[PDB]
Amino acid sequence: GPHMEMGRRIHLELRNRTPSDVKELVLDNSRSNEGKLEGLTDEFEELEFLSTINVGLTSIANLPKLNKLKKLELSDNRVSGGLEVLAEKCPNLTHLNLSGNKIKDLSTIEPLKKLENLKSLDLFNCEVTNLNDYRENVFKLLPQLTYLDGYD
C-alpha cells in the first residue's frame, strides 16, 4: 500500500519489546518485498492475529511457523495460490480472509481442507464467488467450515 516498507512497520512495532510479546499485528498498507512477506519470523510465538491488507502481496510462501495464529487477514492483495502453506505454518487457524485476491476456482482453495480448525472463510469479490452454486460447492469442499462470507 502507500505506507512504509513492511520490515520498517514491524521494527516500529517492536521498539521496546520482542517478537514473542506480540499478540496482534496490523501491517495493512505497508509495502511487501516485491510481493513477499518480510520481517515476520518464527519468533512470533504468541501472535494470534495478523493483518496484511493491501501490501501488494503475491505469495504467502515466506510465512513463518506461527502456531498460535487464529486469524489471518490477507484482503486486497494478489494471492492466487500456494495456500497449502497455511496448514504447515498456521495449523490452528480459525478465521481466514482472502477477499479481493486472485482466487479464481475451487482447486485454489482445496488446500484449506487441511486446516482442521478453520471456522470462517471470506472470499468477497473474488472471481470464485461467480461460480454457479458457489456457496454450496465451497461448503462441500470444506466440510469443517461453519461460515462463508459471514454466514451459514
* Among residues 9, 12, 16, 23, the one that binds Cl ion under rule CB under 5 A: 23
Picking from 90, 83, 108, the residue whose alpha carbon sits closest to that of residue 50 is 90
The span from the CA of 106 to the CA of 104, in Å, is 7
Grid coordinates of 49: 492475529
The residue range among 15-23, 29-37, 54-62, 125-133 that interacts with Cl ion, by the rule CB under 5 A, is 15-23
Q: Return the closest-CA partner of residue 39 out of 50, 86, 130.
A: 50
CB 9 to Cl ion: min, Å: 14
In this chain, which stretch among 24-32, 75-83, 86-94, 98-106 interacts with Cl ion, using CB under 5 A? 24-32
Interacting positions 25-64 with Cl ion (CB under 5 A): none
Note the residues at the interface with Cl ion (CB under 5 A).
Answer: 22-24
